[PDB]
């Protein structure tokens, strides 16, 4: 005998962790503060080429 | 020799004394590759006319890279080098309580979250 | 020829005489690839006006690498080379007891744990 | 200081550090007469462009003679001098297992009976 | 033409006469790529003043390599070359029994395990 | 010393090592008269710049005659001399499987009936 | 190695092989001081066009003196040197009975009392 396999079928289902993530308000505030600080820090470097 | 145990949170690192000398103490971390690892240089001396003292503490750690896992020939090569030196100028005739308070203040400033942010995000200290 | 059996602990290595000559004896280890293996050079001579003698013993071993297991074309290539030479200057009219004591002291210094640490951890000898 | 204990079989000899220096470590045996005794010179350095290293180990021992037991005047005078130097050229980026195997092979070659016969009876190594 | 069948143990190789000439017979193995394969050169002549004869037999085989399986462009390239020549100097007025005994001795020396070890492990013949 | 046993079919011949040297190994057969017997010369060397090697194997056997059985007076005198040299040029970094296949092919070509006919009947190889 | 036992009448002396080589065999007696002792040089070769052979046997023994028993400083110093060489020119195709008779005659001439008197009293041989 000689069997031919199609690897596009012999794989289990998709896990249940492929859902939308949950982000808290504290995490959002922390990330926004960090982003604002980094943005204000990047500005001070551009004026060096005055 | 002399062993120093450092707790990082989940693992314990061991530093071993290598170059035992009075004017220069060299501690080296023993984990795997000795080249490009964690090294510590300590020095103690005097100053002027036997007034105060001078203590120097430097900590270096150079990262290494290797391609023998995929590429078929590359020796472990160092990448960048980091230097973190210190300078302690404390007079002998001082105060034990003042020295303890200064050490506690330094420990608090090191353990605070502002210096960590200054190191990571490169944001100037000012919270 | 001339065979030398060396016990490493769990296996036995065999070195075979290759270049039989008075002023230069070359022993080579026979295990697999002859190129980049264990070689030993021995030499014996005199000095000055038939006073003392001179014995030289060198041991070399170069590591090899190969990529034919994964890469589809790479000949066995040597990497680094290690040289460990010696120098024996013992006069003829000496003392058998003194020579035996010196050999025992050398054997003890070789078998001690300080030289092993100096070789491995590259820590200067001083325990 | 730094003490080294060597076991000869029935007695224990003690070597003491005398000249503590990085580029030259001088150990001297303390038994009786300091002049004409057992001395050991150790040196460690680098090479080329921070590639490998170089270790040198020399062991000297000069015999002494005295006639004050019978003759009514003769200071302790040295007789012959023996020099046994070494040379270690091991690269940093090597292999711990290979270094351990090389050290074990060297220890076996030192502890074998062929080198002892070559030293004592001055017979060329070849059994 | 002229076909020669050689049994290796599990497969049979076929060599075909290519260059039919008296003073030089060239046999070439036909398997796949003709370049870098098995070739055999045979020659027969006389010597001096019609005393004895001279027979020469050489066998060459150069390995080939190719990268068209993975790399997208590399012609079959030869690597090393091996030369195994012979020399037969047998006089005409000899002895058939002596020639048969010599051929049997040569066959036994070829089929013995000592020459195989000398070829593989490169260990000098001496068991 | 070193003994080699060769089986001719009904009797066993013994060759003994006589001139033990690295660059020239001389084996002689011990049966009766030592002069005009079976001798074997083996040599092993390198080539160029440590690339490959060179092995030489020669086998000589000179027949002897004597008239002391009938004639009053005649010392054993040699008649003809046969020379069968070899030449092995195998590189170190090769292939064990390729070397084994080449040795098997050489053994088959030696044991075949074509070379025997070429030796005996002096007929050129071509069946 | 190779040991040779010689019986002098009341004690047995032991000579040990030192320098094992084909063209030069050096045997040295092991009793005490190796310098200035009993040595024996043996050599075997051929001659002309593979006609006869040449054997050389030399026996040397230099006496030593020492003053450390009374004088307070004198190393063992050699005095005179004696050389007794030989020369054997025996052809291969000879006679076993003739060789045995010649050896017996030489042994008788050595064991006779005339050569002993010639050696001791320096009186010319003629009794």
UniProtKB/Swiss-Prot annotation, chain A:
Q: What is this protein called?
A: Maturation protein A
Q: Which organism is it from?
A: Pseudomonas phage PP7
Compartments reported by the entry: Virion
- Positions spanned in the full protein: 102 to 151 of 449
Protein's job: The maturation protein is required for the typical attachment of the phage to the side of the bacterial F-pili. Binds to sequences located toward each end of the genome, hence circularizing it. The RNA genome-maturation protein A complex is released from the capsid upon host receptor binding. Maturation protein A enters the cell along with the viral RNA.
Family in the record: Belongs to the Leviviricetes maturation protein family.
| Disulfide bond residue pairs | none
- Record text on subunit structure and interactions: Interacts with the host pilus.
What lineage does the source organism belong to? Viruses, Riboviria, Orthornavirae, Lenarviricota, Leviviricetes
Curated annotation (Swiss-Prot), chains B, C, D, E, F, G:
What is the recorded phenotype of mutating residue 58 to I/N? Loss of translational repressor activity
Cite the GO molecular-function annotations of the record: identical protein binding; RNA binding
Under the heading InterPro entries, the entry gives: Phage_PP7_CP (IPR015148), Phage_RNA-type_capsid (IPR015954)
Q: Which domain of life is it from?
A: Viruses
Q: Name one GO cellular component term.
A: T=3 icosahedral viral capsid
Cellular location of this protein?
Virion
- Similarity remark: Belongs to the Leviviricetes capsid protein family.
Q: What is this protein called?
A: Capsid protein
């Amino acid at each position: 005998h000689s069997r031919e396999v199609d690897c596009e079928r012999f794989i289990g289902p998709v896990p249940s962790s492929f859902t939308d993530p949950k982000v808290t308000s504290a995490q959002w505030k922390f990330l926004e503060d960090m982003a604002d600080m980094k943005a204000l820090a990047d500005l001070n470097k551009s004026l060096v080429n005055l | 020799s002399k062993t120093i145990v450092l707790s990082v949170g989940e693992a314990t690192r061991t530093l071993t004394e290598i170059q035992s000398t009075a004017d220069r103490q060299i501690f080296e971390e023993k984990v795997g590759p000795l080249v490009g690892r964690l090294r510590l240089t300590a020095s103690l001396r005097q100053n002027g006319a036997k007034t105060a003292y001078r203590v120097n503490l430097k900590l270096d750690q150079a990262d290494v890279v290797d391609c023998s896992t995929s590429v078929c020939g590359e020796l472990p090569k160092v990448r960048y080098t980091q230097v973190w030196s210190h300078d302690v100028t404390i007079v002998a005739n001082s105060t034990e309580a003042s020295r303890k308070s200064l050490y506690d203040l330094t420990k608090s400033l090191v353990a605070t979250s502002q210096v960590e942010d200054l190191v990571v995000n490169l944001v100037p200290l000012g919270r």
